[PDB]
Structures are given as structure tokens and as C-alpha cells.
């Protein structure tokens with residue numbers, strides 16, 4: 327009767343988006359504005375904006391009505 | 392997200408012919424209502440299209456000079472509201488002058504661009520009494536606009552997908568030495584794409600990618616390897632061909648767009664004002 | 671309209687709710703921005719642990735929103751002294767809350783009003799996040815957010831320090847508070863003002879140093895506090911196992927980046943350890 331984690335499987339109809347923690351190690355973060363110390367203090371990192379932008383760029387790219 | 396959005400589910404249509412059927416149904420239904428209540432006074436669907444294009448340009452002009460500066464997302468949301476509303480409604484029943492302002496008002500609310508109503512109507516080039524009347528009309532039509540959008544208010548625009556594609560190009564496509572020089576021209580194409588029915592026919596990501604590839608082709612840069620290699624389309628050939636055909640169709644939509652003509656617009660505006668004066 | 675009024679459910683700070691046929695109806699600036707926020711967000715979301723919007727109607731500038739009728743809320747469960755909350759029940763509530771939050775955060779939306787009364791429970795024991803009148807999209811650098819969000823007893827320390835930009839931590843912290851309220855049956859940090867809220871947080875958990883919160887002093891409303899040593903979590907929650915204490919510590923990390931996300935919380939051993947979460951049909955019901 328135990329619980330096992332299963333990741334959300336939502337079809338994006340587009341190219342795979344690199345994982346959030348991967349972005350910095352993959353060079354993406356070199357192309358977004360660095361988060362200010364206040365932003366980091368609140369928990370806002372440039373990785374979030376980069377990930378959202380990539381997800382929106384790839385969302386539904388392969389989908390046809 | 393777009394991939395499970397109301398926009399994808401309900402406001403992305405299969406072809407231009409479907410949009411034509413919707414608009415013709417709206418025009419015919421208004422004609423039937425007018426006949427049942429009560430001649431060349433009625434506008435033809437193509438005249439309705441010319442008027443809708445004219446007033447969409449008017450909405451763009453209104454948003455461009457709006458103070459405080461309207462974010463591009465709000466402008467795109469308002470234009471999408473306008474297109475969707477006049478998919479299923481006639482300009483002869485609801486005047487596009489008021490409807491476009493209601494679109495801008497509702498879009499400002501939806502996209503969390505907090506603007507007071509008096510400073511919203513202060514942007515209108517009208518007298519204070521005229522601004523008050525326009526505000527009253529906008530408030531009357533806000534709920535009508537929301538109902539005619541079927542309570543689907545989130546609009547996915549191509550601007551963030553465009554930014555994400557630029558990030559991806561800078562990261563994974565070094566052959567394009569500086570993707571930023573593609574921006575301006577691509578943005579130009581985006582504007583042209585926004586003038587057509589493409590926003591009702593293609594995904595925001597497809598529109599952004601079409602703009603970027605069109606800008607690249609304009610500069611003599613070929614980025615087919617970006618699609619085939621980086622976007623993993625060498626592993627799925629039918630997907631690559633389908634995306635290429637979607638982009639070609641969008642480019643064709645831009646190519647065959649015809650801006651409204653001033654004399655025809657004046658004649659149609661006279662006809663529209665005659666329609667609204669009566670009934 | 672097409673719904674007949676059957677009972678008066680209650681009121682909030684923005685609208686009045688009534689039970690109708692079952693559904694629940696929530697009733698110069700135009701249509702209220704809170705109602706529009708709820709409409710625009712709930713129309714784009716479909717998850718079993720997120721309240722489902724069924725309709726909307728109104729006239730002129732007035733509007734009513736229709737939702738599924740939710741039998742009760744977590745606040746009622748917590749306050750019912752006749753109700754016993756076993757570890758399994760707590761695990762079930764926490765699991766459903768975190769699954770809804772994982773879905774919500776995946777779609778780049780912060781609830782920003784998480785609290786037991788905003789976690790509704792139906793007759794089948796399915797928890798649903800509700801009251802999206804404060805919810806907002808995040809991940810956009812150009813959008814500026816106010817720090818007033820979240821009720822004070824559940825407000826994260828970064829918000830109390832005036833953070834304009836923030837992420838999922840503001841929800842997760844509230845989740846932690848909710849978890850604490852599930853474990854103690856009373857509000858964890860019942861401050862009466864922002865300063866007293868920060869004081870209660872620091873007296874219970876300790877004053878965070880630079881190591882625990884690298885950019886703390888840069889927040890616009892940051893004020894230096896007396897160094898409190900805090901109270902060890904096993905002292906506060908004497909009946910909590912090691913896995914549950916690990917989850918609590920992760921949820922109450924002062925650094926919002928280090929604070930565990932909903933996905934990270936769901937993967938923790940506490941949820942996969944014995945005993946398993948209570949099936950929704952077996953969750954306790956506050957009979958009068």
C-alpha cells in the first residue's frame with residue numbers, strides 16, 4: 327500500500343528540454359541575464375527564466391491541429 | 392503551457408477555410424437576426440475582414456502610444472482577443488472601435504498589467520466626456536467579450552518562444568556565430584505574421600521558429616542543420632517535413648496578405664456607421 | 671440562471687460562496703481582477719488535486735464563478751478535536767498537496783495563498799488546491815511581484831524580508847507550515863505582525879546565518895535580528911520520525927533555493943516509507 331514517485335508525463339509535442347540543474351553545465355546560462363543577489367535571496371535564479379524560455383520555445387513545435 | 396492550453400485545444404484551427412466558415416456563419420446569423428427583427432446595408436464577409444484588419448491596425452496604434460508603456464505580451468493578448476471575437480461575431484452587431492478598446496482593457500487585466508481605468512481612457516484622443524462615454528461602453532462590453540472568448544483568457548504569444556529559440560541557438564548552434572543579428576528582421580517578420588490568421592492556425596513556437604528561419608534566409612544563412620541535428624529531426628523525417636511544410640504555409644500566408652485600402656476602408660466605415668445608426 | 675441556490679456556504683475577503691445544483695458559486699474598474707485571475711488560471715489547469723472551474727456567469731461588471739462542491743477544508747479537519755490525525759492521514763494530505771503543487775509549479779504558477787482553509791476536501795477524500803485569487807505566473811524576470819502575498823502565519827521569511835522576486839519556495843514554506851499545523855493541531859508560527867512573524871520564525875528555527883542564507887542581507891526589508899539558537903525539530907515534533915523530520919527541515923530551510931521543491935519533496939523517503947498514505951475513502955470526516 328506504499329507510495330512510489332512517478333514523474334509527471336505531459337506530452338509537450340516538441341523537442342526535449344534540458345533539465346533545470348543541467349542548464350548551467352550545458353552553457354545555456356551564459357545567454358541569460360545573471361540574477362541579482364536580491365533575486366537569489368528571494369529564491370529567483372536565472373535558471374528559472376532560461377528553463378521557462380526553452381520550454382515555451384519547444385512547446386507544441388511538432389503539433390498540428 | 393501551450394501544449395495543454397485552451398488556445399491549442401480550442402483556438403488553433405485546421406485551415407483558413409474553417410475560419411472562413413466561422414466568419415461567414417457569423418455574418419449570415421447577424422443578417423438573419425436583422426431580417427427577423429425588421430438590402431445593401433449589410434456588409435459582406437470580405438468587407439468585414441477588411442474592417443477587422445483596419446481596426447486591428449488601430450488597436451496596434453493605440454497600444455503603441457499607450458502610457459504607461461504596454462508590454463508586448465499585453466498587446467499580443469489584445470490582438471488575439473480581437474481576432475477570436477470577430478471569428479464568431481459581426482462588426483455590424485458590435486462596433487470594432489469599442490471592441491478593440493475592450494480587448495486592450497481586458498488584456499491589461501489578464502496579463503497583470505495593472506492600469507487604472509481613468510488612466511486607461513486618458514490615452515484616448517477624445518474629450519473627457521468622450522473618454523467617460525468610451526469607458527462606459529468598454530465596461531458594458533467587457534463581460535460580452537469574455538463570454539465570446541468562452542472564458543479562455545490566457546494567450547500564448549510567440550515572444551517568449553522567440554527568446555527561448557534565441558537562447559538555444561546561442562547555446563547549441565555555434566555555426567550561427569551571433570544569433571542576435573537575426574532578431575530585428577525576425578521581429579519584423581513576426582509583426583507581419585501577426586497581421587494574418589497565422590495566430591489562429593499555428594503554434595506560438597512554430598510562428599517564432601518561422602520568423603527566425605525567415606530572418607536567417609534573408610541574411611543568406613541556412614540553418615537546416617539546426618532543425619535536423621539540434622532539434623533531433625534527423626531521427627524523425629516525417630516530423631521534419633511536416634515542420635518545413637508548416638513554415639512554408641506560414642510564409643505563404645504572409646506573402647498573400649493584402650493590407651486594407653484607404654478608399655475601401657472609408658466606404659466600409661461609412662457602411663458600418665450606417666449599420667450601427669439603424670436597428 | 672441554470673443553478674438554483676440551495677445553501678449559503680460562507681464568505682471570504684473577496685466574495686460570498688453558496689452551495690447550488692452539486693456545485694459551489696463564488697460571487698468603474700470593471701470585472702474584479704481576482705475573479706479574472708481565478709478564471710484565467712483555472713481554465714489552463716487540469717489536475718485531480720487542483721480545484722476544477724465548471725462555469726462563470728454575471729451581468730455588467732459582476733461575475734460569479736462555479737466550482738465543484740468541496741465537502742470540507744483542511745482547516746476544519748485540523749480544528750476538529752474529535753478527529754485523530756494518524757501519520758498515514760498526514761502523509762496522504764501532504765502527498766495530495768504536493769502532487770497538486772508539483773503540477774502547478776510545472777506550469778509556472780505559484781499559488782501564494784497556501785493554508786489549510788485553501789486545501790479543500792471532497793466526500794471521496796481528494797484534496798484540491800483552491801482560492802487562486804492570489805496565484806500568479808513566475809519565471810518571468812520582467813514581472814515584479816509584491817511581498818504582501820501569503821497569509822502571515824504561512825508567509826516565508828524571504829517574503830517577510832520584502833523579496834520582490836521569488837520562486838516555488840513561497841509555496842513550499844507554506845506547505846511546511848501546513849505540515850506543522852497537521853502535526854501540532856495549532857498554527858505553527860502565529861505572528862501578529864511582520865516583525866512578530868519573523869521573530870517567531872527565528873525563535874523557533876534559529877536566526878539564519880550567512881552560510882544558511884547567502885544573500886539574506888540584500889533583501890530590501892531585511893533587518894538584523896537577535897541571534898536565536900532555535901529549538902531542535904525533534905523537540906518541536908516529538909512524535910515525528912527521522913524521515914518526517916528530514917522533510918520538515920527541507921521545507922523550512924531558510925535559503926529559498928535550497929528549500930526543497932515539490933518534486934524533491936515527493937521523492938523523499940518519508941512518502942515511500944511505511945506506512946503508506948491513507949486511501950482517500952478512509953480519510954477522516956468532520957461529522958458536524
Ligand SMILES: *[C@H](CC(=O)Nc1ccc(C(=O)Nc2cccc(Nc3ncc(Cl)c(-c4c[nH]c5ccccc45)n3)c2)cc1)CN(C)C
Pocket residue numbers: 679680681682687694696721737738739740741742743746790800801956957958
Ligand atoms: C452534521 C453533519 C455535517 O457534518 N454537515 C456538514 C459539515 C460541514 C460542511 C461544510 O464544510 N460545507 C462547506 C462550507 C464552505 C465551503 C464548502 N465547499 C467549497 N466548495 C468549493 C469552493 Cl470553490 C469552496 C470555497 C472556495 N473559497 C471559499 C471561501 C469561502 C467559502 C467557501 C469557499 N468551498 C463546503 C457541510 C456539511 C452537521 N449538522 C449539525 C447536522
